[PDB]
Write a protein that holds these residues in place. Sequence first.
Motif: not given
Length: 127
Positions: A35, A38, A89-90, A92, A120, A123, A127
């Motif tokens: 985290d 991120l 958020s979406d 993660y 978003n 992220l 990905k």
Amino acid sequence: AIDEIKSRGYLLVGLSADFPPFEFVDENGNIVGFDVDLAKEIARRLGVELKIVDMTFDGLIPSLLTKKIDVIISGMTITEERKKVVAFSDPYFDAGGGGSGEQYGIAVRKEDTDLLEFINSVLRELK
């Protein structure tokens, strides 16, 4: 909200550093984990510095509401209960595989729509 973060030149991320491997205090007393990595990525893509604000897990949404932090990145499961009070958020992190069981999200104040849209985007890029 992004204009005001960029003007300050830092992002305040709330977490509870008692949850390895996501956030924990290492042998050198530094807060580290998935985290934190991120948080650092998001701050870097906003062009700002990062301040991790360590607190108790139950304190995170209260701190976000009172604007002590911009976002929560703290192994926080997206739940219907938490969606009453904050935006996520979406996901993660998917604990269970194929979107099954606990999905972790970044919590944002519901008013901070630009910041959520940007997180978003980041992220999808990660990905």
